[model samples]
Structure formats: structure tokens, C-alpha cells
Target chain A: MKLYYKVGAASLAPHIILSEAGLPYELEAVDLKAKKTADGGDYFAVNPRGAVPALEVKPGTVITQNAAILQYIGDHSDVAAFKPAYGSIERARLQEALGFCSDLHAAFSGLFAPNLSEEARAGVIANINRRLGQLEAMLSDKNAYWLGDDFTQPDAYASVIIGWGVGQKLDLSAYPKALKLRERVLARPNVQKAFKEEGLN
Target chain B: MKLYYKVGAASLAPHIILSEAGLPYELEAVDLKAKKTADGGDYFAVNPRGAVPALEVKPGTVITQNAAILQYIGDHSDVAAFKPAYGSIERARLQEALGFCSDLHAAFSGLFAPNLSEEARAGVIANINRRLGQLEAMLSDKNAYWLGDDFTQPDAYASVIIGWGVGQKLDLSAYPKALKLRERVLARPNVQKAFKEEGLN
Candidate 1:
């Protein structure tokens, strides 16, 4: 399987997750602006949206969407450490985490708007910080990961997103728990390897 | 199970699906501004985010998020028509649909922003239209539903969203196929029941 990714994109979440799951997969860097892959293939043929994090699971079938791709990797891998079993409420919680991540991630899109006013940008930042506060509340003082004790997929995904806060210069200091979780995720050997492979380290 | 909903919110998607599946569930109207349920209970205690579409699967076990709650209903229901089987590629496709809807639904939030510029609002509408066009492409000339001949979860969710476009005065005529699908979804007896239950009809 090949996972199409771009540096610092949402794809990094699943890349770190696939590594953590010990799954065997290939990678192709996408030139999102050019709609081409590193190997000169048309990325649009793989994903018409030209979005990164599209996983080619087989010959012609590729799955897109960061949360879905992460869940797919977790489900296929034997580890079961990254996700809960299907049909379980824990799995439903997993979806909730992914939903939170997806919504928070979309909230950052406004940062890319050209000529975006400081007031508007500040509003976006405030909104993100509010969500981050909610996420920080989800963390436990006794647990190491997002859902507690076991390292999970949501931790990987949320880490990548909060890590992007540095790039955008968004003030994320209020959510110390999230920042700490980001540090924990970055410390994982597999996550480190994935980051290095993506030239994100 | 009980579904907390408001007429025309994303909650309508799951509310319609629950009725379609013939699931036994209770409904509560949330006074979103006050963060209170119909019974005047603390909504934040039920869902910290104070979001609607929180399904109480049993006493004190409320599940949140439209996709997650819908999936929970789809998984537990005797009816198989609402969702794809868990662990199938079709299930992955369902996630893709949910992911798409989640993102598209969030896109509408900007429309509610106070003092948003007309140019910015037009841009938002254009972006939504582009997404609606992509969704329109997902439909088949031969199939009444987004996935195929049978109605499924994605169609229900998408129909509610596109239906919102009518109230927003967003020009949806560019995608006649989606408008048609919305019409078909509204025509379903179960959907009508859901709408009337929520006072949406």
C-alpha cells in the first residue's frame, strides 16, 4: 500500500499512525500545488480532490480523508493499540475524537485566507483555543495519551494538528495538556521515524 | 436510545436515519442559547460542547456527533439499509461520506459570522457550490441515491445539508442532481415523520 502525503499536511497524522501500527506501506510525496506526485504521477487520478493522505490500499482502490485513513490503518494492522474494536462504545469514542480533530482542523483554514483581517484572524484563533481547551479537558492527569494509558490514533492526529500551531504562530500556550501530549507523541520512536521520513523533523 | 435534536440542524440527519431504521428512541429539543434540554436539564453536563445530536444509548451514556451517533444507530439497528457493514470497503466509503459532510457542514458556519463582508460571503458560497458540484458528480444517472439505487446514511445526511441551502438563499440550481436527491429523501415517509417530529415539515 502507498500513502500519498505532503510535508506538514494532515497526512502526517496517519503517517505517524501507520508507523506506530507497524504496518508495511510505501509513501509518495504530493506536490499539492501541481497536483503531481514525487514520482511524476497525476495525484488527481489517485484522489480527485488532490488532497494528501490518500492511501492506496490495493491496486486501484484508495481511501481518502485523514480520520478514515487513520481508522483504516488501525483496523488493518494487528496491533489494535491505535484503535478500539468495531461496534464498541470505545470505537464510538474514537469517532468522537476524530470528529473533534476534523472540526478543529477545518477551523485552521481561515489562517490561509489572503488579506484576512487581524480581527477575523484573532476570532479564528480564539475559536481554536476554545476547542483546544475542551480537548485539554479530555486529558487525564493519570494517563499518558489522549484517551489514557494506551497510545492511540487520536493522540497522533491531535499532536500533528496542535504541532501546526507553531507554524501558524497561533498562541497555544493555554492548553498545556495538549502541548504536553504533543511532546509525548513526538517522543515516540515510530512517530519520530515518520516525522524524519517526511522531513518534518 | 434518545436523540437530542433541533429542527434543521445536523441532528436531523441522524433523526431521519433513526426513523428509517425503525429504532426506538426519544427526542429532546435543546434550547441551544440557554444550553438546556427540553426538560430544563444542564445540556453541558450531557455534552460539554453543548452540541446537538447527542444520543443517549442508555441512561447516562450519551453519544455525541452526528456521524458517530448515526453510525451507532446504523450499527445497532436490525435494518441494514442505513449503513454499510463494518470493516467493508463500503464502510470506508461511508466514512468518506461522513467526512465530506462534516467538512461541508462546518463550511456553513462562516455564513453565520457577524458583519461578514459580502465578498467573503460570496467566496464561501462559491466554495460550498463547488463542493455541492462534487457531490452531484457522486450521484448516478441510474441511481436515486448517492451510493446507488437504495437510500443510505450519506444520502440522508447530504440531503439535510443541501436542504439548508434553500433557506440560506444559496443558489443550488447549479446542481440539479443534488436538489433531486433532496426531493427524493424528503418524499420518504420516515423522513416526513422525522421532519414533522422536529416541526421541520
Candidate 2:
């Protein structure tokens, strides 16, 4: 399988899952700003919506949208570790995380993109802060990771997004537990490795 | 179980599923504009995010977010047919619907809400139109439903959101299949029943 990605977007969630799943996959870069692929084909041809992180499961078959890609990759993983044992309440738990993340990604990205109207940006940013507070509560149990005990796919997923929250200059000091988890995540060799390859580190 | 929902939102998805699953459930109402529950407590107290469609599985324990709620209802169903047999690719397929609906719902709600600035709304509406075209393509094989040969939870989920798509005054006539499916869905006994109870019919 191959994943189409941009520098620092929700793509990282699936990319992280793929890396942790030990799946044989290739990453293709889509210069989203340029609206062109590496070979210069129109990026919209692959995903008409023009979003990044489109996974080509085969040469022609592709899956767009981050949440779907995360679940798809998790299903193909060994130990099926990151995702819940399908159809389980645990799966519901993961969906809660994924839904929350999707909303967060949307808020921080385009809705709050610097180019947006100051009013929209401020509104979305405040929403992001409020949601982040709720997220901090979830991870407060801090038994180990976000999904409890073993670090599931959502751990890396939430970590990647939290990294964005940091980039957005949102205050993380109040979210001590979530911040601690983010701190531990940043220290990981795998995260650093991915960030470096993506030119984000 | 009791479900707290707004008039017509993602909660409607699980409500349809519960009806399709033929389960008995009590429904409660929330006034999102007021951000208060039927009992007069702050909605945020139940789901800090203050989003609609929070399903209380039992007294005092509520599940927020539609993607997770649909799965919860599907799992508890007698035949467990709305989703694919637990943990199977079919389940992922069902979730694909959830995730797709979420992405669409986010775009539409963000675009259409009176809260957004006119400029931001324009960009989002254009994006939403592009996605609706994509949905048209995805409906090629299914007849009067999202997944062929079965009326699953995702179908109930799709019905609600697509109904919103129609409400946006966007013409879905080009997608004949989808239009037909939407008609069938709106005509469903449960849907008609729901509308009547809500005083829409």
C-alpha cells in the first residue's frame, strides 16, 4: 500500500499506525500547496476533494479521509493492537477518540488557517482549546496512555495532533497530563524519525 | 437506554439504527441553541463539547458522538446486522460510512451555520459540493442503500446527513441513484414515524 501525504497534517495518524503495524507501505508526497503530485499529475485525480493522506491500497484503489485510513490500517495490523477488537465497546472507545481528533484537526487546520478571517480563526481556536481541555481530562487517568494500558493507535494519533496544538501556540501548561504524554511522545525515536523524514522536526 | 438528541442530527442515525435493529429505547430532547438538557442542566456538563446526539446507554453514563453510538446500537441488536460481523472488513466498511458522514457533516455544518462568516461559508460550501459529487460516485453499485444487499446502521446514518445535504438547496438530481435512495430512506416507516413524533410530518 502507498500513502499520499503532505508535510504536517492528519496524514501522520495513519502513517504512524502503518509504521507501528509493521506494514510494508510507501509514502508519496503531494505538494498540497502546489496542487500537484511528484510526477505532476493533478492531485485531485486521485482524490477529488484534494485532501492529503490518500492511501492507495492497490495501484488504483484508494481511500481518502484520515479517520477511515486509520481504521483501515489498524484492521491490517498484527496483534490488531492499536484498534479495538472489532465491534467491541473498545472499538466504540477508539471511535470516540477518532471523532474527537477529526473535529480537532478540522478546527486547527483550515478553519483556523492564518488566512481565515480573524473572527473565524479566533472562534475555532477557542473551540480547540475547550476540546483540548476535555481531552486532558480523558488522559488524566494517565495510567499509561490515552487509550489506557497499552498505547493504542490513538496514542500516536492524538500525540501527532497535540503536536499541532502546540504549533498553533495553544497553552498546554494547564493540561499537565496530556502535556506529559506529549512530552513522552516527542522523546520517542519513531516520532523523531517520522518527523525528520517529513521535514517537520 | 435513553438517547439525548436534537431534532435532526447525527443522533438521528443511531435512532434510525435502533429502529432498524428493532430495539426498544427511550428518547430525550436537548435544546442545542440553549445548550441545556431536558432536565435543565448544562449540556456541556454531560458532553463537555456541547454537541448533540449524546446517548445515555444507562442512567448517568452517556456516550457522545454518532460514529460510536451507531456501533453501540448495532452491537446490541438482535441479529447484529447493521454493521459487518464484529471486527471484520465489513465493520470497517460500516465505519467508513460513519467517517465519511462525519467529514461531510463537519463541512456542511461549518459551512451553513449562521455563526460562520460569509467568506468562510463560501469556501466550505464549494468543498461540500465537491464531496457530494464524490458520494454520487460511491453509490454506483448499491441499490436504494449505501451498501448493497443489506440495510445496515450506516444506511440509517447516511439517511440523516444526506437529508441535510438536500436541505442545503444543493441539487442532487445528477445523482439519480442517490436521489432514489434518499427518497426511499425518507419514506422509511421509521423515518416517517420519527418525523411525525417530532411534528415534522
Candidate 3:
């Protein structure tokens, strides 16, 4: 299987996941700016949307979307550690985290990206802070991670999300639990190895 | 299981799905504006984010997020027609559709909602059109349905999505195949019944 990725983007979630899952997969980097891969291939043909983190499970069966791809990598390999098997309650929690990360975290990233009018950007920031407030509430200090007791997909999700937060220069001090979670996540040997390989951080 | 819902929000996706899959579930209505369910209960306790379309599978085990909940409904009910049995390639494709709907379709919804700023709102509209263009390229007109022959989850997704486009008054004329696909989806007996039961046009 081939996983197409771009550095420092949502692709990092799946990259950390693939490394942790211990899957033997080939990595192909995409030059997102040029809309092509490192091997001089059109990324659009791999995923019509031209988004990174497109995994070709087979030549014919290609999947995109970070949430689905991350879960798929988790479920197909080791359902025990990476993700709770699909249809299990624990799996549902991971999905909720995935939903929140994709919608809220990605929205924050877009808010801070280029081409925003100041007023519009301010509204986006306000909305993000509101969502972050809710996130802070959802994640209490007692829990080891987002779901509880394990470093799973939601943790991988948080790694990318807090990374995005850093890109926007959001103050992570207010989100102490999340900041602590990121610290543990960054120290994970697999995640560190993936980041090193991708030259992120 | 108690399925918390409103009339026709994202909750309606799983509402129609649970019913279609023949799962026996109790329905609980929520007033989003009032921030409460019909029973004077805290909706946030079940789903910390307090969004609708949450299925309480058992006490202390609540599943929010439409894609995961829909999969849970389909997988648990032993229903093959609604969504294919989990762990199949077809299952992944079905999941891909759900992910697309939530991430892209629902993302567009946020842009059009009254709360979004003028520029963000415009960006959302453009984003919808952009996704529609991708769908036009990816979807096959050779089949009468979105997923080909069977009325899978993606078909249900596209039906609701185009319904949004219709509600927002976007021009569906340019995408002739998508328009036909939308019509076929609406013409389904279950789809019509869901619209009426949910009081959706």
C-alpha cells in the first residue's frame, strides 16, 4: 500500500498512526504547492481533490480524508491499540474526537491561513476559542488522554491539532491538559521517528 | 438505545438510518436554541459538544457524530442493505462517502449558517461548488444511483446534501448527472418517507 503525504499538515495524523501501527507501507511525498508528488506524478490522479494523506490500499482502491484514513489504518491493522474495533463503544469515542478534530481543529487552521479579512479572521478566532473552551471542558485534568487511559487515534488527532494551533500562534497555556497531552505525544518514539522522517518540527 | 435528535439536522441522517436498518430505538427531541432535550435533561452530558444525532447505545455510552453512528446502526443491526458489512472494501467506500459528507458537506453547512461572516459565508458557497465539481467528476452517471444500483449510505448522503443546495438555492442545472442522481435519490420511497416524517421538504 502507498500513503501519499505532505509535511506539517493533517497528513501528520495518519503518518504518526501508520508508524505506530507497524504497517509495512511505502511513503510518497507530495509537493502540495506544485500539485504533484515527489516522484513527478500528479497528485490529482491519486486523489481528485489533490489533498494529502491519500492512501492507495490497492491501485484501484484509493482512500482520502484524514478521519477515515486514520481510522482505517487503525482498524485494519491492530484494532486493540491503535483504535477500538469498529462498532465498539470505545470506537465511538474515538470517532467523536476525530469529528471534533477535523471540524474544529481544521477550522482553526483555515482561520489563521492567508487571505482572511481582519474582521472575518477575528470572528473565526472567536469561534475557535469558543470551541477550544468546550474542548477544555471535555478534557478534564484527571484523564490520561482525550478518551481515557490509552494513547489512541484521538491522541494522534490531538498531536496534529495542537501542531496546527502552534502554526497559528495560539496560546496553548490555557489548554494545559491538551498541552500536556501534546508533550507526551511528541515524546512517543514512533511519532518522533515519523516527524524526523518527514522533517516536521 | 435512545436516539437524541431534532427534526432535520445531521441527526436526521442517523434517524432515517436507524429506522431503515430496523433497529428498535427510543426517540428524544432536543431544542437546540433552548440547549436542552425534551426531558429537561442536559444534552451535553451525553455529548459534551451538545450536538444532535447522538445515539445513547447504553447508559454512560453515548455515540455522537453521524458517520460513526450510522456505521454503528448498520453494523449492529445486521443490516447489509443500508451499509455493507464492516471490514469489506465496499464498507470502506461507504465509509469514504460518510466522511466526505461530514467533513465536506457539513463543513459547507457551517459556511451557510446565519452565524458565519459575509466573507466566510461566500467562501463556504464557493467551497460547496468546488466539491460539487469534484463529485461531478468522481460519480458515475452510468448507474442510476450515487453508489451504483444499491441505495447505499452515500446515496442517502448526496440526497440530503443536494437538498441543502436546493434549500440554499444553488444552480444544480450545470451538473446534469448530479441533478438526475439527486432526483433518483428523492424518488426513493424511503427517502420521501423520511422527508415527510422528519417534516423536511
lDDT of 3 by residue, A1-201 (tens): 788988787788888888898888888889988899887888898988888888888888898877778877886876575556567777667777777777676567657567778876887788777777777787867778888888887788777877777877888788787788888899999999889878876
TM-score of chain B of 2: 0.91
lDDT of 1 by residue, A102-167 (tens): 877876766776899998798878778777877888778798887767888888889888988888
Over A1-201, each residue of candidate 2 has an lDDT whose tens digit, in order, gives 999998877788777777767778898899888789999999988877788878888876777767678888877776455656645667877777788877767666755455677765778778778777878876756467777777676777778888887886767788888787777766767667677768887
Candidate-wise lDDT, in order: 0.83, 0.74, 0.76
Clash pairs (backbone) in predicted model 3: none
Measured on C-alpha atoms, candidate 3 has an lDDT of 0.76
TM-score of chain B of each: 0.93, 0.91, 0.87
Give lDDT tens digits, candidate 2, residues B11-96: 77777777767778888888888999888888887787788788777777677788888788877777555656543556656777
Least accurate 10 contiguous residues by lDDT in model 3 chain A = A78-87
Q: Give the TM-score of candidate 3.
A: 0.91
lDDT of 1 by residue, B108-166 (tens): 76677678999879887777877787777767789778766678888889998887788
Compute each candidate's TM-score over C-alphas. Answer: 0.94, 0.89, 0.91
Q: Which ten residues in a row have the lowest lDDT in candidate 3 chain B?
A: B78-87
Candidate 2 colliding pairs, count: 0
